[PDB]
Design a protein around this ligand. Structure first.
Ligand SMILES: *[C@@H]1O[C@H](CO)[C@@H](O)[C@H](O)[C@H]1NC(C)=O
Ligand SMILES: [Cl-]
Ligand SMILES: [Cl-]
Ligand SMILES: [Cl-]
Ligand SMILES: [Cl-]
Ligand SMILES: [Cl-]
Ligand SMILES: [Cl-]
Ligand SMILES: [Cl-]
Ligand SMILES: [Cl-]
Ligand SMILES: [Cl-]
Ligand SMILES: [Cl-]
Ligand SMILES: [Cl-]
Ligand SMILES: [Cl-]
Ligand SMILES: [Cl-]
Ligand SMILES: [Cl-]
Ligand SMILES: [Cl-]
Ligand SMILES: [Cu+2]
Length: 235
């Protein structure tokens, strides 16, 4: 159970974005139904009044929280991967539009999942803004908590992989469009019951065996890391 507070750009906090430049849901409940429109941008997908200005090559940091800013972030039980996707705003996230900019699942050296590291990072993870066409975009940050992913929601609706999905409205101003955005996958649609990484038993299967759900990360990506870029508590 986690939500996005806002973003940072190049290490500078852009301010509370909830319902402003984040298409925030009303609470931190997961989405579980892989076929639902809620997979696109969560349960209150509508245009919000602001878009954060960035340029190609900027670092865009999402900052998550649980109940209050810079708290425990997400329950430690919620081991799983993190991804970030991009789509043009004109799509409203519909159709085959989402292109993967970042994936992190399990770090063997550290023996930690992405979520574990997100907690350590005070909720912060980043991507580098790609050289796509200037214009309005949606950046879709997605945390998959696997603690009940031994079951499939479609079979047992009280269990399943839990998706914490947040869409930020981002305007890319300066970019040479030298890596134009390639085809994307749909959400809902890309993840199905048989997709690798959706059904997994984190209690019996070694974490080193985990394969996150495709698509692969786009070659045009620059991204990205799970790491604290700024100290929220100084504000
Ligand atoms: C899952 O989402 C689909 C598509 O919106 C819907 O038809 C179905 O009823 C949902 N399942 C549940 C259990 O709500
Ligand atoms: Cl839970
Ligand atoms: Cl609710
Ligand atoms: Cl739940
Ligand atoms: Cl759901
Ligand atoms: Cl704006
Ligand atoms: Cl808060
Ligand atoms: Cl916990
Ligand atoms: Cl960190
Ligand atoms: Cl550029
Ligand atoms: Cl679907
Ligand atoms: Cl498994
Ligand atoms: Cl993986
Ligand atoms: Cl590619
Ligand atoms: Cl980064
Ligand atoms: Cl700082
Ligand atoms: Cu939760």
């Amino acid at each position: 159970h986690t939500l996005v507070w806002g973003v940072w750009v190049n290490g500078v906090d852009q301010g509370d974005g909830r319902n402003i430049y984040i298409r925030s849901p009303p609470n931190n409940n997961p989405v579980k139904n892989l076929t639902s429109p809620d997979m696109t941008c969560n349960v209150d997908n509508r245009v919000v009044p602001k878009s954060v200005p960035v340029n190609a090559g900027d670092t865009l940091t999402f900052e998550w929280y649980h109940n209050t800013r810079d708290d425990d972030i997400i329950a430690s039980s919620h081991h799983g991967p993190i991804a970030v996707y991009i789509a043009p705003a004109a799509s409203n996230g519909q159709g085959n539009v989402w292109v993967k900019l970042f994936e992190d699942a399990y770090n063997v050296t550290n023996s930690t999942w992405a979520v574990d590291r997100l907690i350590t990072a005070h909720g912060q993870h980043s991507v580098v803004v790609p050289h796509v066409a200037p214009g309005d975009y949606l950046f879709r940050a997605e945390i998959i908590a696997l603690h009940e992913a031994d079951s499939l929601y479609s079979q047992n609706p009280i269990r399943g992989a839990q998706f914490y999905i947040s869409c930020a409205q981002i305007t890319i101003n300066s970019s040479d469009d030298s890596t134009p955005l390639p085809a994307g996958v749909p959400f809902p649609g890309a993840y199905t019951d048989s997709t690798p990484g959706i059904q997994f038993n984190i209690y019996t299967t070694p974490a080193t065996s985990y394969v996150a759900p495709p698509p692969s990360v786009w070659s045009g990506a620059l991204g990205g890391s799970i790491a604290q870029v700024g100290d929220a508590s100084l504000e």
